[PDB]
Amino acid sequence: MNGDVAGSLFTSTYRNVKLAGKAPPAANLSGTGSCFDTTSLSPARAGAHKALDVQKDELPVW
Amino acid sequence: FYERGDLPIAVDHRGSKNMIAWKVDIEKLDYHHYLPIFFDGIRETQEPYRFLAVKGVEDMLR
Amino acid sequence: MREIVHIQGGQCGNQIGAKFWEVVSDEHGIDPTGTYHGDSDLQLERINVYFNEATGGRYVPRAILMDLEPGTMDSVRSGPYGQIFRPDNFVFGQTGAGNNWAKGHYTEGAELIDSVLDVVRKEAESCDCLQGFQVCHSLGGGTGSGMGTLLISKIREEYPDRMMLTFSVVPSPKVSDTVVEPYNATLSVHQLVENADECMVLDNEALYDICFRTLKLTTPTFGDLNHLISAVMSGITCCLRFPGQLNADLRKLAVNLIPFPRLHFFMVGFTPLTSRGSQQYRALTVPELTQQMWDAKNMMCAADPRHGRYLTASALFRGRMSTKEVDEQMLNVQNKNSSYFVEWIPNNVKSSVCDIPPKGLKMSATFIGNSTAIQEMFKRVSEQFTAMFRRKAFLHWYTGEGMDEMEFTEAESNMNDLVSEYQQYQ
Amino acid sequence: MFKNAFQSGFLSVLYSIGSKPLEIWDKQVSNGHIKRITDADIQSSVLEIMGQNVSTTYITCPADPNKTLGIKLPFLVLIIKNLNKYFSFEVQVLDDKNVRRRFRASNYQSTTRVKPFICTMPMRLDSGWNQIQFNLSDFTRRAYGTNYIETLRVQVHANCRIRRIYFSDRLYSEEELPAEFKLF
Amino acid sequence: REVISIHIGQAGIQVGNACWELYCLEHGIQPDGQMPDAFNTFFSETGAGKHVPRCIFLDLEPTVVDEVRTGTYRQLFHPEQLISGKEDAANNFARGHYTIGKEIVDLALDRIRKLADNCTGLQGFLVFNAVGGGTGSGLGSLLLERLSVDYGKKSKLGFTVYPSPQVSTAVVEPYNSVLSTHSLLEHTDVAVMLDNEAIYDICRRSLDIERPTYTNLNRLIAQVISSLTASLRFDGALNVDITEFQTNLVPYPRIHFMLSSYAPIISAEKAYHEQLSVAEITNAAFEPASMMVKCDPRHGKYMACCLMYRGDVVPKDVNASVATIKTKRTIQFVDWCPTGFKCGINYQPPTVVPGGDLAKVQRAVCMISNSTAIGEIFSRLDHKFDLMYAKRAFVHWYVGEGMEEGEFSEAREDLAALEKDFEEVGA
Amino acid sequence: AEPLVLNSVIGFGGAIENGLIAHPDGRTIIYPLGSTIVLRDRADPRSQEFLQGHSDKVSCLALSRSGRYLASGQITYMGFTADIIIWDLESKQLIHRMALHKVKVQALDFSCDERFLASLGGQDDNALVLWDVASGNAICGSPCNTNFTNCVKFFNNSPDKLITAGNFNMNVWTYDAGNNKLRPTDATLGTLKRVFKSVVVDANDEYAYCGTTTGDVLQIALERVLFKNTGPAKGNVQMGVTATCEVPTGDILVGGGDGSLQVLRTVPEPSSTNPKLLRKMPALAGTKVEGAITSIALADMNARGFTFFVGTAMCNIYKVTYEPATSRLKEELVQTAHNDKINGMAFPNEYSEVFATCGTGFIRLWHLTTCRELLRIAVPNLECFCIAFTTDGSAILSGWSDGKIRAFGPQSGKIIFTINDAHQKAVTAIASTADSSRILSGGEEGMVRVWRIGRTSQTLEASMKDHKGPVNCIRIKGSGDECVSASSDGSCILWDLHTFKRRTSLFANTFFKSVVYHPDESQLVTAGTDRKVTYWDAYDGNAIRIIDGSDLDEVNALAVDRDGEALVSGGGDKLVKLWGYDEGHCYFVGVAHSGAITAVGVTPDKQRIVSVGTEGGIFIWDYQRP
Amino acid sequence: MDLKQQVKNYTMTIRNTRPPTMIKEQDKSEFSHFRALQVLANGDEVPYEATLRNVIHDGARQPKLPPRQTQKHPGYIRNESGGFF
Ligand SMILES: Nc1nc2c(ncn2[C@@H]2O[C@H](COP(=O)(O)OP(=O)(O)OP(=O)(O)O)[C@@H](O)[C@H]2O)c(=O)[nH]1
């Protein structure tokens, strides 16, 4: 229950990246290109969990 | 009970034989809860406690 | 058992606090990573005062860092003994007040004071028996003066029964950094006189003068200035953290040094202070420490103690000594300089002894004097304030942020009457 | 412990405002958690015990299971907050026949069973913060012909916000209670 | 015959931290609490091979208390004896008497109660404190009043340390002293004045130590206490208990302030220098350079005097010495007391504590007298009190704590009446 | 006059940074002693020739890559220039002595081509000077920084240098023959303001590794002097990093502030699929070591593993083996010594191969034949003074600076009793009587006390306070009646036990230091600060004869053979004198004890002489007829 | 008076009931050390660590400081009459 949900965004991000010192997760920046231009949309789905484990030969035999 | 400190007794420590300073008046004291305690305490022979037990028994009986 | 909560505000406050925590960690023998590694057992028994115990044999400081710029936090985490601070005590803004008391006390305060108050209160119940608060800051800046004053107001509103130390550095016309120094200082001291239980007045000019004359150093860097102030900061509280032949409480010092509720502006010194070229030609004895301590050139304020009268004074010693030599030396200093003390308060000297001298020294002392010479510095600031105010210079950036003229008028009146009582009792 | 203590009219065994509130208590947590957080109602630090299984997570009064504290005070008072979940607490007492009775007050049972060793009782709590006073002497008198002598341990279970559990000797009113023991 | 000692404040606790090792050294008790009947007056033998003292050290700061807890005598004092509060009185009489006193004195007195019940032939009380501080003044007076309302009849030897006229280590100590004395009058029966500058001078001249600390002061105070309690502890040719002072040293219900002195304070080489006899030590026990409170008795007249002796002392020489002193005119008595001397003798000589400088003397004398030099001392303290009170300095701390200027006014007028009584009686 | 053969030696200085170093060829170790450097055969503990000539304590060592040239620097009194001394390890002679640095020389470094030396000196000097090896000349110098600089190291091509200041900076200095000047370039730290202690350079000059006092390794890419990834990922070490060494592989062996060894991988690597590199992971968590690490040296090159010699602040030299295949460090301590000045030593009665030597806070029992320390007792923070066995082997008495006398047991080191306060300050002399029931003590107050010890108690008898100065020695006669006390009033007092009185008082102009009974109790031999030994008649007290041996400085050490023919004496100088008793004749030895000798003794079996000085050194000699 | 203090008194009461301990801390053991000394006396091939053992006692409580000087040079200060204290 916070008066402003976005009331901690910048401070939390800065504390995580610098103050606490833990490595910040830097991923999903592929295909965004530069600024001032539209980002190329990837056809991948964010919500979908496309794990699809492939144990082709490491599966033990009964 | 005396070690617990629920007995309202102090020693006068007078020049004559010492009397018992009673924190509360003995008249309204609950005899049912106190008389068996002191009557059981008559048995012991240690110096600081036997005098207290005997004097308390005497005072209640009087 | 007795607990002090430290708060750092502004650039000067944060740097001085970092140096102070380095000094305290060295004195208690804990490494810059947070693990105790000392030899004597005197250190363990009084680490609850400045260090809450943490899992893994690590001790974290009981201080709250407060500012508005990322640069100060980056510098604090950069320096040595910067890894011991708890990362969640960094109450932190984004923009910076920029030498504006309005920006520090009315605009950014309205959204930072709630968070800083929550952290301070939570750290307050983190300790069982509170003793007091100590805040280290400036009186000329924006993020250190205004926000510090607002935090003091809220604290003293919530906890009306605890000691209050405000290590505040004050401007001097010779060493002048910014331009609205009188504007910030007048309002800050206006609130401090009605709010703070005592104020530790410091200034850069006196420290520079001491470093030039006594220490005979070539480049008196900010590190040296902060180290001297840090030595004072540890000396004033050594009594609670170590046993001695005459233990003195912080409230004990407050009662001995405050005869009237508003005459609570003290001036500080430290001894011994000698150059390396002369360290070998000097002994270590109470008479020489006392003469250096009472020398006017060992004082850390731009106010000559000989231009006024000592209402009260106190000396806190560290090291193995004799109370006989201590109190006879105080007798001598009171008798020879009899006219310099007030006449209607006998025994103007309080003395305390502690059994632990600081690391690197055989013996130390700390002077704290409630004299009436501070009125000179206050008049020095007030005349600048009146000169700026008669023309309303710079006043529009204060009036355009919610403020008006009445608070300035009241501050000027308050400072005038306050220096009037200093002069009257002088 | 506590056998040589003074045991005046008031005696606290756990206070939520302190450096180490849980020094004599022995936390035993499984599928749950314990915290010290600031409540949004009384603006102070209180301890939270939460657990999926109320019978698993609890805190006992004496750390050593064999070694038992000694308190002669009749009344035991808790200051808790109702989280609208299952909550229970247990106390051991000693009678003059030198046997150990047990009193367990629970939120999730209906009948009041009386056994030779355990008396299980129902409790009904109000909405927010409330103080419960237990009156060990009267409960011992009602549950058995015995009378109260001594308390051997106390243990509170999951789903509770707790602060200032203590002992007392009288039915103190709110106005006559000392300040640090009040609710506001 | 047993007497119980209680210590309040830093000064009282350290005086006790001297007296107790002196006592166990006298009785041959190792610090852990066992020997390898005379001890019964101080140490109670409990269980088997364990002796515990009859005292309570109590103070609000924990520093001195747990320094004692972790010091040399950890096993001697029972852990329940050492009471410790949380924060100082901060040289505030009101803070020490009304804020933390209401919380600590109840436990303190209900502990001394169990001490008393364990005791059987309790002779009386004796308190160790300095009125300059906050705790030893405020809560000392509070505990005094409560003990008086509890027992009342029994004697209360209060060995109180007052501030030196010109040596000072505080600021509001005149306030603390007058406020404490206002209660010390009508509750204590025998109050013994002690100073610090006088002891500094004593150890400077006689004990020829150039840099004396509090340790030597406490050691010699302990020596005085042991010398005045040796009559109960051991047997002599003429013994007196605590109750002879109560009748021979208090001629009037309110004039009870006794000055103390001790002889011979001799170092190691001066022991071989000077000849130890009775006449010269009795003479040395009377000049101003050998009394524990810095004041000049020649301005006053003696009312009563008591001489305890330890060691190889026969009544012949003390009788001759008292006769010579009475014939001497440099010291003058008062008309209301033709027989102003009370002698007492004990066979055991004083002991030597390794670590002190006092040498093994075959005999010693302790002097306790009543005079008016206390009258000038109280007048001086009253003057330096009213000087500061004229400007209402430091009164805001008291009024904030909860007191007012009322009790200040009554304390001032009560001390004025006390001086009136001294100047009337000395006539 | 003839020199005395020097048998074994125990002792080295572990406080010196990077002091203990191995010769690059063959079997040779070298470490700094008090004010001399000591060579040792790495194979067998046969002490090699010592190299004297230093005015005061040596503080830094350096060795050429070829191992032919050695450089040593010392610390001198304030105002007197410290001198760097150069030695040839093939022909052991002084080659160059250069005195330029004001107070002390911080560090020295030799070049890859063994042509230049870098000298950094002074807490206050802070001037870097470059010398040449061909002649005792100085090429060029420059002030380093406002803050003091700690260490200097060369590259493997050596026109360049790198130094790291103590407080807050780091520089790379290049040397050019065009201007004969040193051009510095400061390091580019992002924000770090760390305090550097030790530095090491790679085998190919790409990076340099410096240990901060914050407790982490710090990597600097050279030729641009840029900051890169920091040290251990698994937190920092318990105190500041104190020692660093370069494995011949791509690893760094780092020794932290609390005896902690770690092997850190040097190759960078990116983690979490980001441009940011992860911290240097520890490829091996080495076990703890008792002493604080101060020196690491790569001793041997073996295809199965790498051997390193590690010095400690507690003066404990360790040999550690590191196996890259199976990551594990194996440690064996090879020698131990005293970290601080030692004073006083004891011999068991008619028993030879036990030494009781005590230093600050430490009692140590040593074995004579093999020099291996058998037992140690440690009190946290105290200064030790006179210690002595009882005439029975039951107890070892020890004085302490706080005024307490403590008695310990020989086996298991159990304390049997202690006196809570024997003297008002430090006690200086303790002696035991033949009956083992009485003990004599003497402190700095100037009083002598006597204590009777019963099976359950310790009682104090009459105490005599004749002396006005510190009591320096106490000696009891075969029967307990007679005991002599020598103090600093210029007087020696003879006491009586049956009645605690004094018989006579021997007097001299200067302070008496040592007094020894002659066998059969015929006479007394005393030594003091008059530089004169004096014979005294034991019965009445009279000066028989005065010998002016060693008039240069004071003498405080005396012992006499069991029969009474030989008399061994110390002094304020560095030589040990061996006189005949009846005649004044010399059989002394000169080269030993870089520090002033403080005590001496002769083994009861008349085979060996043991001497202990103001530095942590025990020198086992060989006895011979005078 | 307080809960922490009461627990401390209980712990210290137990610590006074227990008999005093001569050794605060021990390394290795006396028995193993005796075997190490025995094999050393019998022959060779004994490591240094085997023979070396240390025991730590309570010792001084205060930190280590250089001793005080109580009396200065005798020619500087004197008492009222004369002498050297
Ligand atoms: N004789 C003697 N007096 C002492 C000693 N220590 C303190 N005092 C005296 O005590 C007076 C002040 O009271 P303190 O004992 O210091 O402290 P307190 O009585 O507990 O009062 P607070 O400090 O407010 O808690 C000083 O004026 C000293 O003269 C001591 O060791 N020996």
Ligand SMILES: Nc1nc2c(ncn2[C@@H]2O[C@H](COP(=O)(O)OP(=O)(O)O)[C@@H](O)[C@H]2O)c(=O)[nH]1
């Ligand atoms: N002693 C000391 N004083 C400093 C330091 N940094 C800044 N100051 C002083 O602080 C004053 C300016 O305060 P400022 O930084 O603007 O306060 P802020 O805006 O609230 O952070 C200057 O006059 C400086 O003399 C420091 O590191 N040490």
Ligand SMILES: [Mg+2]
């Ligand atoms: Mg006090």
